[PDB]
Amino acid sequence: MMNDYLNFLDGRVSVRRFDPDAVLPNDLIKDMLEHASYAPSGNNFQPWRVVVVKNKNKQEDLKKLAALQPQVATASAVFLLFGDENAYDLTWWQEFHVQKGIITKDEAAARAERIRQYFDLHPEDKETQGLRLDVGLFAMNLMQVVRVYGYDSVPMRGVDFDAIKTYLDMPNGWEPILMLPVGKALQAGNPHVRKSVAEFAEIIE
Amino acid sequence: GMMNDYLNFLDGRVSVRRFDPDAVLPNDLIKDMLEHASYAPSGNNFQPWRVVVVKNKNKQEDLKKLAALQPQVATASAVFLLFGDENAYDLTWWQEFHVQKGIITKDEAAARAERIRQYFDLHPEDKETQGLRLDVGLFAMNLMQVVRVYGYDSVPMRGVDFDAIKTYLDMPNGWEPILMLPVGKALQAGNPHVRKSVAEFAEIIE
Ligand SMILES: Cc1cc2nc3c(=O)[nH]c(=O)nc-3n(C[C@H](O)[C@H](O)[C@H](O)COP(=O)(O)O)c2cc1C
Ligand SMILES: Cc1cc2nc3c(=O)[nH]c(=O)nc-3n(C[C@H](O)[C@H](O)[C@H](O)COP(=O)(O)O)c2cc1C
């Protein structure tokens, strides 16, 4: 069963050939997003914002902004993952965590000052560098979750995100992180080729 | 059935901060964990992650002092330090690696390399910390799921002094610290995930 889970995880590869007639229903999209959201993030700020485009005409427009990569138009839905800098809001953080019964109002106020002091020293963790890590965690989770339902994906950045935001009238404070076309594979992805563990990792005892 | 089990497994990834200080994580498994985590995607398959795994309680106690005395650093079976190396975005390597592995032709490599250069020219951040954070973040999440397969748990961390840690371990300067990940056998279960609802962060347009 652990072997089944390992084989499942190993099965994620980029798929770029999707069935243009396959449908990804909104009920499953919502479930996929809910499960993806269980990804960790610094202080549980959950800075991800997602816009799912499920309309072929519009995906064709997006393909024109994505170096004409075909998967953008054949996919059942194109998930656009953004990070919101304004997500690192300490008033929201206190309210949310107290309302959910995780911590008291006093504990939340004290923790919030420590988080402020941290960001004061490490401003990048509440800017694009922070967002890229937090939304990257989310994205990897989403890529495994969509597969539970029989779908596949390909993560993408070789696209004109400035033009995409303008096309979709996106807030200027939302930083584009990744475009993720999701669909039914017509062709399996290729086997993983990677550098060995000995080439990138050191174990010290 | 199958789908329920896979979802339950993914959902089971949770932050664990109470580990069994006597539990041993064998090195064969550490290597297996890193091999499977490596299957994570990265832009152009540059795989810019570098990892140092500290499995030595004496050293972990020193690391705990540099991690605001968070106890999980010292009780864990091993502490996985994940870095990104910006030197990894090297077009010579990229060609050599993909041609030697039979993924693409030599001439196709030179052509692809130039398109990769063009892309980085437009978006230089993607070969710098912004790119590393994303690429190593993908690896990190994959690692966190993989450790669960073997009955272990983890907690991702940045509330530590990465500057002092790099110095304590004699790490290269070109390596950007991304995340500290203690891994061990849970003595206490993680909490159910508390999250904003899908409608609070996502829109579906048809
Ligand atoms: C940040 C990022 C950007 C990527 N950009 C694209 C892209 O624009 N087009 C594409 O076809 N693949 C893109 N990829 C997919 C990678 O090429 C792919 O993950 C890598 O070659 C490893 O293959 P695998 O995903 O099949 O394991 C991107 C991946 C990441 C993580
Ligand atoms: C970048 C990052 C940094 C984090 N820093 C810490 C940390 O220093 N200490 C800690 O106990 N947890 C840390 N966390 C864990 C988060 O608090 C945790 O993921 C979040 O509260 C959600 O809980 P969950 O992982 O159990 O779902 C960090 C997580 C991320 C992604």
Automatic annotation (TrEMBL), chain B:
**Gene3D superfamilies documented for this protein:** NADH Oxidase
- List each copy of the Nitroreductase domain by range: 12-185
- A Pfam family (short name) is Nitroreductase
Q: Does the keyword Transport apply?
A: no
Query: For binding FMN, which residues are annotated in this chain's numbering?
Result: 13, 15, 17, 70, 158-159, 193, 195
SUPFAM superfamilies, per the entry:
FMN-dependent nitroreductase-like (SSF55469)
Q: Which residues form a coiled coil?
A: none
Molecular function terms from GO: nucleotide binding; oxidoreductase activity
Keyword annotations from UniProtKB, A to Z: Flavoprotein, FMN, Nucleotide-binding, Oxidoreductase
Decide whether keyword Cell inner membrane is in the record.
Answer: no
Give the record's family classification.
Belongs to the nitroreductase family.
* Protein name per the record: NADH dehydrogenase NAD(P)H nitroreductase
